[PDB]
Design a protein around this ligand. Structure first.
Ligand SMILES: *[C@@H]1O[C@H](CO)[C@@H](O)[C@H](O)[C@H]1NC(C)=O
Lengths: 49, 34
């Protein structure tokens, strides 16, 4: 995938998190990206290895 | 009629806590007490 320039690999799944308007990415305790907002549908996805 | 307050900020270390929704609901000021 390539979400607004951010590349990686994983499995995309629908999420139940509610991002605030000024947020685009979400990180975990390990400092890794686990959530993202689709720049077109404006829905939130979960990233899993 | 009305009132306002004024305080300055300094460079310090803080420990925040995010709840299940991502909202900050607590904090700790390192080096404010022993
Ligand atoms: C925060 O998330 C919980 C479940 O994880 C939910 O029950 C609660 O309504 C959420 N808070 C708000 C303000 O929506």
């Amino acid at each position: 995938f390539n979400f607004n320039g951010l590349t990686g690999t994983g499995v995309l799944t629908e999420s139940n998190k509610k991002f605030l308007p000024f947020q685009q990415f979400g990180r975990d305790i390990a400092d890794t990206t686990d959530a993202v907002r689709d720049p077109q549908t404006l829905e939130i996805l979960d990233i899993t290895p | 009629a009305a009132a306002y307050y004024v305080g300055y900020l300094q460079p310090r270390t803080f420990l925040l806590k995010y709840n299940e929704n991502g909202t900050i609901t607590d904090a700790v000021d390192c080096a404010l007490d022993p």
